[PDB]
């Protein structure tokens, strides 16, 4: 009864809508960017936090928008403000961009399935 592993299946690269309900607590993830504004990316999702409990965001996602506010060209500081001030219901449009993300983290690369690997 040979198993069927998720881990080979390609990670979808189209934009997705994620709605997180977090009341008045943190969203539970970290973003990375530059003050240049070349994309804002998720670097880390906290185990058990609202973003984790959504189950639909991952390290390497680019945050395209929050509550209709375009963040494709945001600074990290101003993106954080937007997220922290987004209210109890947070509607994120995200898009998986592991190649771009992998430039941030040491000894990281993307494998054949699109997964981020760190050596």
């Amino acid at each position: 009864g040979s198993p069927e592993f998720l881990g080979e299946e390609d990670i979808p690269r189209e934009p997705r809508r994620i709605v997180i309900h977090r009341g008045s607590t943190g969203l539970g993830f970290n973003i990375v960017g530059t003050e240049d504004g070349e994309g804002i990316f998720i670097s880390f999702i906290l185990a058990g936090g609202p973003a984790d409990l959504s189950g639909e965001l991952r390290k390497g996602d680019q945050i395209l928008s929050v509550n209709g506010v375009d963040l494709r060209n945001a600074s990290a500081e101003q993106a954080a403000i937007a997220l922290k001030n987004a209210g109890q219901t947070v509607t994120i449009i995200a898009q998986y961009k592991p190649e771009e993300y992998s430039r941030f983290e040491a000894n990281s690369r993307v494998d054949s399935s699109g997964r981020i690997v760190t050596d």
Binding site: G26, F29, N30, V32, T34, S75, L83, F104
Partner: peptide, 8 residues
């Protein structure tokens, strides 16, 4: 580095 990381 240009780079900035923050928790939200």
């Amino acid at each position: 580095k240009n780079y900035k990381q923050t928790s939200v």
